[PDB]
Amino acid sequence: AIKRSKKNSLALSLTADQMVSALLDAEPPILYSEYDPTRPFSEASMMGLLTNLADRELVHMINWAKRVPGFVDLTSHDQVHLLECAWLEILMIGLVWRSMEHPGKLLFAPNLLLDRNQGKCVEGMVEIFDMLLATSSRFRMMNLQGEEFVCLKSIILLNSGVYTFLSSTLKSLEEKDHIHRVLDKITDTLIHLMAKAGLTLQQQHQRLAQLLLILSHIRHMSNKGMEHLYSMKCKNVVPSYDLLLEMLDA
Amino acid sequence: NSLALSLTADQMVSALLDAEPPILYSEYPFSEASMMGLLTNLADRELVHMINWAKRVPGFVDLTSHDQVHLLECAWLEILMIGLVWRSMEHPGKLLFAPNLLLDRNQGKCVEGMVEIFDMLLATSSRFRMMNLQGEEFVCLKSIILLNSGVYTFKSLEEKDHIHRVLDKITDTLIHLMAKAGLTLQQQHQRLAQLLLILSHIRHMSNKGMEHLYSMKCVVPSYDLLLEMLDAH
Ligand SMILES: O=C(NCCCCOc1ccc(Oc2c(-c3ccc(O)cc3)sc3cc(O)ccc23)cc1)[C@H]1CC[C@H](C(F)(F)F)CC1
Numbered sequence: 001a002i003k004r005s006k007k008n009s010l011a012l013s014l015t016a017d018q019m020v021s022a023l024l025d026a027e028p029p030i031l032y033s034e035y036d037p038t039r040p041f042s043e044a045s046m047m048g049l050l051t052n053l054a055d056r057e058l059v060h061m062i063n064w065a066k067r068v069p070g071f072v073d074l075t076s077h078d079q080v081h082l083l084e085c086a087w088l089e090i091l092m093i094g095l096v097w098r099s100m101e102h103p104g105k106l107l108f109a110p111n112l113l114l115d116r117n118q119g120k121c122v123e124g125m126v127e128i129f130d131m132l133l134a135t136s137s138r139f140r141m142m143n144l145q146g147e148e149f150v151c152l153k154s155i156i157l158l159n160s161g162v163y164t165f166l167s168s169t170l171k172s173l174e175e176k177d178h179i180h181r182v183l184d185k186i187t188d189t190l191i192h193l194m195a196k197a198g199l200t201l202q203q204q205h206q207r208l209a210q211l212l213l214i215l216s217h218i219r220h221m222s223n224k225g226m227e228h229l230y231s232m233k234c235k236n237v238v239p240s241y242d243l244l245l246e247m248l249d250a
Numbered sequence: 251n252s253l254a255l256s257l258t259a260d261q262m263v264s265a266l267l268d269a270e271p272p273i274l275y276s277e278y279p280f281s282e283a284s285m286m287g288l289l290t291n292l293a294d295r296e297l298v299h300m301i302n303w304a305k306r307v308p309g310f311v312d313l314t315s316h317d318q319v320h321l322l323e324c325a326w327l328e329i330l331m332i333g334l335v336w337r338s339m340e341h342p343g344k345l346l347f348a349p350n351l352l353l354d355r356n357q358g359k360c361v362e363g364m365v366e367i368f369d370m371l372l373a374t375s376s377r378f379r380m381m382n383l384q385g386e387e388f389v390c391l392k393s394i395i396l397l398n399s400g401v402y403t404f405k406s407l408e409e410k411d412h413i414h415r416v417l418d419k420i421t422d423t424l425i426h427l428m429a430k431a432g433l434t435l436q437q438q439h440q441r442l443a444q445l446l447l448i449l450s451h452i453r454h455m456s457n458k459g460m461e462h463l464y465s466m467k468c469v470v471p472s473y474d475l476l477l478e479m480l481d482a483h
Pocket residue numbers: 047050051053054055057058083084085087091092094095108125128224225226228229238239241244245248
């Protein structure tokens with residue numbers, strides 16, 4: 001079809017209710033882990049299970065991202081770089097959302113619930129597990145709602161890579177301005193949700209701030225996770241997919 | 251009880267502005283090991299003043315010395331970087347490490363792996379410029395970084411509760427500044443969101459910087475004084 005100019009992005013013409021509806025409708029399928037439960041539970045086998053789930057979720061992630069209002073207005077290059085930036089943060093926020101109602105455990109999939117002591121089966125994992133558990137506990141304590149969750153997940157996609165567009169082209173400035181406007185609309189939607197829930201104005205701003213501050217922790221977890229995943233690739237417990245990496249690099 | 255929680259928004263702004271550290275001039279030929287020596291010497295001197303600034307951030311003194319040290323251990327580089335970004339706002343394409351140390355983006359190429367970090371710092375300064383970030387907001391953001399960046403890695407519930415209450419007061423303060431500047435309610439929450447979203451990028455830059463420094467064989471000389479100032483010695 002026709003690629004609209006940024007001022008004619010569908011994102012900017014959505015009401016708050018329509019933005020929520022769009023984000024809920026984009027939400028990817030629940031996946032079940034496919035595994036043999038009789039296999040001995042080792043570092044290699046655990047990381048293999050998690051890799052297989054990650055690979056399947058990433059397929060659905062791409063289709064989800066394309067359905068996030070504002071995303072497809074970006075160049076294909078900028079789209080890919082948002083995803084390359086955010087993919088682990090997006091996996092992690094999903095995981096902590098899914099795990100909210102299971103204190104002490106991470107619900108990687110409905111049929112794959114792991115506790116922090118299984119995290120110790122993978123060297124370097126338990127520290128990240130504990131951070132994920134703490135984030136899930138914080139979401140539980142804040143009573144994070146599904147409509148808020150989908151807004152936060154879309155914010156991670158749009159925000160985690162915008163600052164590593166380098167402003168070396170005029171197009172980059174247009175892309176940055178567009179992302180800003182979409183992020184403003186998602187903020188309006190988050191406030192709309194909180195106002196409808198009955199929060200006072202002060203409470204609305206405090207809650208928004210607390211939710212956005214958690215995003216900085218999610219970023220931190222992603223960075224530590226990438227460092228951990230690199231170590232796992234050296235041990236040949238996680239694939240390197242180096243040809244995809246050199247693809248993305250060139 | 252905590253003085254921080256009894257303060258009004260106007261009083262909080264005053265306290266945060268009053269806590270601001272001095273501007274240091276570089277004191278420390280010109281290879282990569284010398285570039286890292288220059289930047290490390292500057293960081294070492296700034297850290298002495300940072301610890302005194304941290305102790306003056308309302309709410310910080312209420313924590314145990316071990317928690318104060320934990321938060322600083324988590325946030326120190328974020329704080330150095332946000333200061334750098336602020337200082338560089340009026341110097342597009344350059345990083346004002348000090349008034350007598352203005353470095354071009356391409357001077358990052360002198361240290362392997364540094365120019366990518368320079369680029370992220372420059373992008374942050376550009377963002378602050380486009381938003382016309384104000385000093386009053388800057389000090390709120392820096393305080394948020396100190397309190398937020400290690401809170402998730404921590405009676406311990408009483409301390410986390412205290413920190414979240416202080417953070418809520420800073421949010422109120424940022425909103426108050428924006429309201430007094432004439433922003434509509436919609437503009438206020440949008441700007442709050444844009445400011446807090448930049449802190450995700452500052453965290454990223456810190457993480458990347460820590461990895462880079464670990465690569466570059468890089469405790470600052472003044473470490474013992476830092477702990478002494480924190481009463482952690
Ligand atoms: O797809 C690629 N590789 C294969 C699939 C990913 C392989 O890595 C993973 C990733 C996660 C994983 O485990 C999970 C978490 C986790 C977090 C922190 C840790 O320290 C360890 C684990 S959290 C979590 C949440 C879930 O829902 C599911 C799983 C997990 C296990 C392995 C590349 C992507 C990037 C792309 C690029 F670069 F082009 F963009 C190139 C290709």
